Symmetry: C3
């Protein structure tokens, strides 16, 4: 269905995508499994515009997003398979991040309500999360 | 008011009805009293289409619906007074349900995010709940 | 942006204003600081119509509104700077209120889901809150 139908089912809408901001917290993988069941994936962030929408909408509560490493010693990528713009990302990480604390932080969340808000954390940490699916 | 006004007050909309998914948990009766104050009743489920909308929207959190027995030794009915389709219902109960545990389970909730998701429980159990009112 | 865009970002809409009903509780000042960051202020209540919308939408959970005293021994005013109609207000206070308990209740909240629902409380009490911003 369309914008009205999705918005009237609880989805947010912004720049050609719908977003589901979860009620309850999950691990990164359990979140992604839930998003898949809603025909979605944990959100990518493919513009500063989208970053601004998302950090504002997350209300200062940490939220898992769809950035994860390709294995525990791998490079970051978006689980929805859109291209990961490394250089753009420096504008979105909290100062000092990603810092791979304990060598065990392989997923990312929007930690605070700021443009510089991404932190890497243990994927088994439980947070609210953001699903994204395209407006088609 | 209309769809936009109801959606912009927090109501969901689907197939000619509005739905209010509660913030906080109540007993079955306290939920129904709240729904009445919002010109609604605890939701009926009168199609597989509606069941699908509701279990999806309930996000895997148990939610009271408007099915209750006519007294503690009575037959199931919908509190909004729409006809209860016994045979259709077998498609919506969790396997084993209704099981009338302790002979004291006289109200029903959508317990999980599946098509087979209804469980009978004690009406004094406190859960989130779903109000329904027609789009007129 | 317009009604659809605001509603699709979580804002409620009623009689020419948008409203943000918070996820988490804050002190009165921390709430107001958050509302300002969302181009809003803690809500004023400038009609019985608006009072009805707000108490209904607050779902029986106490919510901070934008009424505060001009200093701890001052008169009530709306932080968004709309005129405070003293005489109208008597229709909206809970019976007995405002009672300035402990001589330390200098902010107001909608405490219950009724037309007579405002209570003065300590501004350092933590409640959910309501931001308002005009539809322009
Ligand atoms: O909460 C303590 C935090 O320290 C930060 O600087 C790290 O980057 C986080 O991953 C860690 O959670
Ligand atoms: O949580 C224990 C549960 O056992 C189930 O099989 C019953 O049908 C429920 O009513 C009960 O709550
Ligand atoms: O909860 C106890 C309450 O007593 C009321 O009558 C006061 O007006 C409140 O400000 C106070 O919180
Ligand atoms: Ca980190
Ligand atoms: Ca049962
Ligand atoms: Ca008081």
């Amino acid at each position: 269905a369309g914008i009205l139908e999705m918005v009237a089912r609880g989805w947010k809408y912004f720049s050609g995508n719908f977003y589901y901001f979860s009620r309850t917290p999950k691990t990164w993988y359990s979140a992604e499994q839930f998003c898949i069941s809603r025909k979605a994936h944990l959100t990518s962030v493919s513009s500063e515009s989208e970053q601004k929408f998302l950090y504002k909408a997350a209300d200062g509560i940490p939220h898992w997003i769809g950035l994860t490493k390709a294995g525990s010693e791998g490079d970051w990528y978006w689980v929805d398979q859109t291209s990961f713009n490394k250089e753009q990302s420096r504008r979105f990480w909290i100062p000092g991040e990603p810092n791979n604390a304990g060598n065990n932080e392989h997923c990312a969340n929007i930690r605070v309500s700021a443009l510089k808000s991404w932190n890497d954390g243990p994927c088994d940490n439980t947070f609210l999360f953001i699903c994204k699916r395209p407006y088609v």
